Coordinates of C-alpha atoms in Angstrom, one line a residue:
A1 CA -17.6 -17.2 -30.4
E2 CA -16.9 -16.8 -26.6
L3 CA -13.8 -15.2 -25.2
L4 CA -11.8 -17.3 -22.7
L5 CA -11.5 -14.1 -20.6
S6 CA -13.9 -11.1 -20.5
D7 CA -13.5 -7.7 -22.1
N8 CA -15.7 -5.4 -20.0
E9 CA -15.2 -2.5 -17.6
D10 CA -15.7 -4.5 -14.3
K11 CA -12.3 -3.3 -13.2
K12 CA -13.9 0.0 -12.3
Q13 CA -16.5 -1.8 -10.1
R14 CA -13.7 -3.8 -8.4
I15 CA -11.6 -0.7 -7.6
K16 CA -14.7 1.0 -6.3
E17 CA -15.8 -2.0 -4.1
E18 CA -12.2 -2.1 -2.6
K19 CA -12.4 1.7 -1.8
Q20 CA -15.9 1.0 -0.2
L21 CA -14.2 -1.5 2.1
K22 CA -16.2 -4.3 0.4
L23 CA -13.1 -6.2 -0.8
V24 CA -10.2 -7.3 1.4
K25 CA -6.9 -5.6 0.6
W26 CA -4.2 -7.6 -1.2
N27 CA -1.6 -6.8 1.5
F28 CA -0.9 -10.2 3.2
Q29 CA 2.5 -11.4 4.3
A30 CA 1.7 -14.7 2.8
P31 CA -1.5 -15.7 0.9
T32 CA -4.4 -16.8 3.0
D33 CA -7.6 -18.8 2.2
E34 CA -9.6 -15.6 2.4
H35 CA -7.6 -13.8 -0.3
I36 CA -7.5 -16.8 -2.6
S37 CA -11.3 -17.3 -2.3
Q38 CA -12.0 -13.6 -3.0
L39 CA -9.8 -13.8 -6.1
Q40 CA -11.5 -17.0 -7.3
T41 CA -14.9 -15.4 -7.0
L42 CA -13.9 -12.2 -8.8
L43 CA -12.1 -14.1 -11.6
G44 CA -15.0 -16.6 -11.8
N45 CA -17.2 -13.7 -13.0
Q46 CA -14.7 -13.1 -15.8
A47 CA -13.2 -16.4 -17.0
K48 CA -14.5 -19.6 -18.5
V49 CA -14.6 -22.6 -16.2
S50 CA -11.9 -24.4 -18.1
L51 CA -9.5 -21.5 -17.5
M52 CA -10.7 -21.4 -13.9
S53 CA -10.0 -25.1 -13.4
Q54 CA -6.4 -24.6 -14.5
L55 CA -5.9 -21.3 -12.5
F56 CA -7.0 -22.9 -9.3
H57 CA -5.5 -26.3 -9.5
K58 CA -2.7 -27.4 -7.3
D59 CA -0.8 -28.8 -10.1
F60 CA 2.0 -26.5 -11.2
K61 CA 1.4 -28.3 -14.5
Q62 CA -2.1 -27.0 -14.9
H63 CA -0.9 -23.4 -14.1
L64 CA 1.5 -23.7 -17.2
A65 CA -1.5 -24.5 -19.3
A66 CA -3.4 -21.5 -18.0
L67 CA -0.3 -19.3 -18.5
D68 CA 0.0 -20.4 -22.2
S69 CA -3.7 -19.6 -22.9
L70 CA -3.3 -16.2 -21.1
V71 CA 0.0 -15.3 -22.9
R72 CA -1.7 -16.1 -26.3
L73 CA -4.5 -13.6 -25.6
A74 CA -2.0 -10.9 -26.1
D75 CA -2.3 -11.7 -29.8
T76 CA -5.9 -12.7 -30.1
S77 CA -7.7 -10.7 -27.3
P78 CA -5.4 -8.2 -25.6
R79 CA -8.4 -6.2 -24.3
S80 CA -9.2 -9.3 -22.2
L81 CA -5.8 -9.1 -20.4
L82 CA -6.3 -5.3 -19.9
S83 CA -9.9 -5.6 -18.6
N84 CA -8.7 -8.2 -16.1
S85 CA -5.1 -6.9 -15.4
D86 CA -5.8 -6.4 -11.7
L87 CA -7.0 -10.0 -11.2
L88 CA -4.3 -11.5 -13.4
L89 CA -1.5 -9.7 -11.6
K90 CA -3.0 -10.9 -8.2
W91 CA -3.0 -14.5 -9.4
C92 CA 0.7 -14.0 -10.5
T93 CA 1.5 -12.8 -6.9
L94 CA 0.3 -16.1 -5.6
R95 CA 2.9 -17.8 -7.8
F96 CA 5.5 -15.6 -6.3
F97 CA 5.2 -17.6 -3.0
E98 CA 5.9 -21.0 -4.6
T99 CA 9.3 -22.3 -5.6
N100 CA 9.1 -23.7 -9.1
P101 CA 11.5 -21.9 -11.6
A102 CA 9.6 -23.2 -14.8
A103 CA 6.3 -21.7 -13.7
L104 CA 8.1 -18.5 -12.5
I105 CA 9.6 -17.8 -16.0
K106 CA 6.1 -18.0 -17.6
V107 CA 4.5 -16.0 -14.8
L108 CA 7.0 -13.2 -15.4
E109 CA 6.3 -13.4 -19.2
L110 CA 2.7 -12.9 -18.4
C111 CA 3.4 -10.0 -16.0
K112 CA 5.6 -8.3 -18.7
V113 CA 2.9 -8.6 -21.4
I114 CA 0.3 -7.1 -19.1
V115 CA 2.4 -4.1 -17.9
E116 CA 3.4 -3.4 -21.6
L117 CA -0.2 -3.4 -22.6
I118 CA -1.1 -1.1 -19.7
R119 CA 1.8 1.2 -20.7
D120 CA 1.1 1.2 -24.5
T121 CA -2.6 1.9 -24.1
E122 CA -2.0 4.5 -21.5
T123 CA -4.4 2.7 -19.2
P124 CA -4.4 4.3 -15.7
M125 CA -3.2 2.0 -12.9
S126 CA -5.0 2.8 -9.6
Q127 CA -3.1 3.0 -6.3
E128 CA -4.9 -0.2 -5.3
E129 CA -3.7 -2.1 -8.4
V130 CA -0.2 -0.8 -8.0
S131 CA 0.0 -1.7 -4.2
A132 CA -1.5 -5.1 -4.8
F133 CA 1.2 -6.1 -7.3
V134 CA 4.5 -4.2 -6.9
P135 CA 5.4 -5.1 -3.3
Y136 CA 5.2 -8.8 -4.2
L137 CA 7.1 -8.4 -7.5
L138 CA 9.9 -6.8 -5.5
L139 CA 10.3 -10.1 -3.6
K140 CA 11.4 -11.7 -6.8
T141 CA 14.2 -9.2 -7.1
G142 CA 15.9 -11.5 -4.5
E143 CA 15.9 -14.4 -6.9
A144 CA 19.2 -16.3 -6.8
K145 CA 19.5 -16.6 -10.6
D146 CA 20.8 -13.6 -12.5
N147 CA 18.5 -14.0 -15.5
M148 CA 15.5 -14.1 -13.2
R149 CA 16.6 -10.8 -11.5
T150 CA 16.9 -9.4 -15.0
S151 CA 13.4 -10.4 -16.1
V152 CA 12.0 -8.9 -12.8
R153 CA 13.9 -5.6 -13.4
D154 CA 12.5 -5.4 -17.0
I155 CA 9.0 -5.5 -15.5
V156 CA 9.9 -2.9 -12.9
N157 CA 11.3 -0.6 -15.7
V158 CA 7.9 -0.7 -17.5
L159 CA 5.9 0.0 -14.3
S160 CA 8.3 2.9 -13.5
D161 CA 7.0 4.4 -16.7
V162 CA 3.4 3.8 -15.9
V163 CA 3.5 4.6 -12.1
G164 CA 6.4 7.1 -12.0
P165 CA 9.4 7.4 -9.6
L166 CA 7.5 9.4 -7.0
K167 CA 4.9 6.7 -6.5
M168 CA 7.3 3.7 -7.0
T169 CA 10.0 4.9 -4.5
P170 CA 8.1 4.4 -1.3
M171 CA 7.6 0.7 -2.1
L172 CA 11.3 0.4 -3.2
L173 CA 12.3 2.1 0.2
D174 CA 10.0 -0.3 2.0
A175 CA 11.7 -3.2 0.2
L176 CA 15.0 -2.2 2.0
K177 CA 13.6 -3.7 5.2
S178 CA 14.0 -7.1 3.6
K179 CA 16.4 -9.8 5.1
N180 CA 17.2 -10.8 1.5
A181 CA 20.4 -8.9 0.5
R182 CA 19.7 -9.4 -3.3
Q183 CA 16.3 -7.7 -2.8
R184 CA 17.9 -4.7 -0.9
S185 CA 20.6 -4.2 -3.5
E186 CA 18.3 -4.6 -6.6
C187 CA 15.9 -2.0 -5.0
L188 CA 18.7 0.5 -4.4
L189 CA 19.8 0.1 -8.0
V190 CA 16.3 1.1 -9.2
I191 CA 16.4 4.2 -6.9
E192 CA 19.8 5.0 -8.3
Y193 CA 18.5 4.9 -11.8
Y194 CA 15.5 7.2 -11.0
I195 CA 17.9 9.8 -9.6
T196 CA 20.5 9.5 -12.4
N197 CA 17.7 10.0 -15.0
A198 CA 15.3 12.4 -13.3
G199 CA 17.2 14.0 -10.3
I200 CA 16.7 13.9 -6.6
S201 CA 14.4 17.0 -6.5
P202 CA 11.2 15.1 -7.6
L203 CA 11.8 12.7 -4.7
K204 CA 12.4 15.3 -1.9
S205 CA 9.3 14.4 0.3
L206 CA 10.6 10.8 0.5
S207 CA 13.8 11.3 2.5
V208 CA 15.8 9.1 0.1
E209 CA 19.2 10.3 1.3
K210 CA 18.5 9.6 5.0
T211 CA 16.8 6.3 4.4
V212 CA 19.5 5.0 2.1
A213 CA 22.6 6.3 4.1
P214 CA 22.6 3.5 6.8
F215 CA 23.0 0.9 4.0
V216 CA 26.5 2.1 3.3
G217 CA 27.2 -0.1 6.4
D218 CA 25.3 -3.1 5.2
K219 CA 26.9 -6.6 5.7
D220 CA 26.5 -7.3 2.0
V221 CA 28.9 -5.7 -0.6
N222 CA 26.2 -5.3 -3.4
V223 CA 24.0 -3.4 -1.0
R224 CA 26.8 -1.2 0.2
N225 CA 28.0 -0.4 -3.3
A226 CA 24.4 0.5 -4.5
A227 CA 23.8 2.6 -1.4
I228 CA 27.0 4.5 -2.0
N229 CA 26.0 5.0 -5.6
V230 CA 22.5 6.3 -4.7
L231 CA 24.2 9.0 -2.5
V232 CA 26.7 9.9 -5.2
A233 CA 23.8 10.2 -7.8
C234 CA 22.1 12.6 -5.3
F235 CA 25.3 14.6 -4.8
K236 CA 25.6 15.1 -8.5
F237 CA 22.3 17.0 -8.4
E238 CA 22.3 18.7 -5.1
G239 CA 26.0 18.7 -3.9
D240 CA 26.5 19.2 -0.1
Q241 CA 22.7 19.2 0.5
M242 CA 23.1 15.4 0.0
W243 CA 25.2 15.4 3.3
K244 CA 22.6 17.6 5.1
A245 CA 19.7 15.3 4.0
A246 CA 21.6 12.1 4.9
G247 CA 22.3 13.2 8.5
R248 CA 25.0 11.6 10.7
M249 CA 26.9 8.8 9.1
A250 CA 29.7 6.6 10.6
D251 CA 33.0 8.4 9.7
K252 CA 34.3 5.5 7.7
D253 CA 31.0 5.2 5.7
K254 CA 31.2 8.9 4.9
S255 CA 34.9 8.5 3.6
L256 CA 33.8 5.7 1.2
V257 CA 31.1 8.0 -0.2
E258 CA 33.6 10.9 -0.5
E259 CA 36.1 8.7 -2.3
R260 CA 33.5 7.5 -4.8
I261 CA 32.5 11.2 -5.5
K262 CA 36.2 12.0 -5.9
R263 CA 36.8 9.1 -8.3
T264 CA 33.6 9.5 -10.5
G265 CA 34.4 13.2 -11.1
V266 CA 38.2 12.8 -12.1

């Protein structure tokens, strides 16, 4: 009987073709016809046309049907999801640009299943696969609903295990350039968790203290509080080196951080 979605090793061929500059890089600001057509060609070589017709419909409806079929493969053909993880995660990023909460819930459920299978099987994720997915998933950290931010962070927590703090942090730092204050604060909270659990030393080449310090002065209280807590987490590991690494801070920003240190240690 035929699989709805292939189980082969064509992922290696896709990664190699991208490195050979024979695939366009999934690094757009917003999806373009060129990226969608490339994905549709690559997925067309892996998926039955009835899945393909749903995947590239307009009709959010028709996406839910594809998502249901794909989520069920986790039970019946999990190697299909693994073999095609890079293409499925790219299709999910296209869904990150639409506003439709019902579809989003099911997209995130698919993303969760895929990153759990990658983690559990110890499947390596290439830099290309990571970069194609994570920067767009981080957009959804700015979702207005608290349960939606939670679902996104649960996927980030699996990827942090697969990818590791050192390779995740540059994308989390880059996310701070966002206009969306929920995205900036949620991204700081992930950095805070890395430092609390593994220390600042593994992250030393990244200039975390200095990049994060200006956000103690952010307009948004959640960003300020998380930025303060990143610097306090650093302090706990490296003491006054935190201050050297951070560089010049507004005097009043520095007092807020000093008071937080004082209070968390009484």
